[PDB]
Amino acid sequence: MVPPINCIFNFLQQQTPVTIWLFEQIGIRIKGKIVGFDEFMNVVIDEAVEIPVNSKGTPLGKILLKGDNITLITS
């Protein structure tokens, strides 16, 4: 077994490309690299990039995305 927390930690260690989907919002996505970790799914994510979904790119700085509105992680 590999828990979610463990996975998150691994991702953090790596600093690999991460693509986050937002909760109750299909059209927008985020793409960056995991810097932080918390007791909840909340994590701080430098080098982030907003993405409108293919139903390209947009400008975006460094961000911490809150735990409640996450859907996907991958790294």
Binding site: M1, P3, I5, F23, T71, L72
Partner: protein, 69 residues
């Protein structure tokens, strides 16, 4: 308090029905008490793949229907 008993679904391909009439696929790798899924990454429902391994949040899950019996 109780852990979700998904030991029967371990290392099986599962159609994760998630929020907003969306879908995810992939083989099940791990889980915890919140229902946060750890799975090997697959396509989003023609069809197209993103990521190598994926970690889905608990609240987003509407269902996770077993593809493999």
């Amino acid at each position: 308090v109780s852990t979700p008993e998904l030991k029967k679904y371990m290392d099986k391909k599962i159609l994760l029905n998630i929020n907003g009439s969306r879908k995810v696929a992939g083989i099940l790798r791990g889980y915890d008490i919140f229902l946060n899924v750890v799975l090997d990454d697959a396509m989003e429902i023609n069809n197209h793949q993103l990521g190598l391994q994926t970690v889905i949040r608990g609240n987003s899950i509407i269902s996770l229907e077993a593809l493999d019996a």
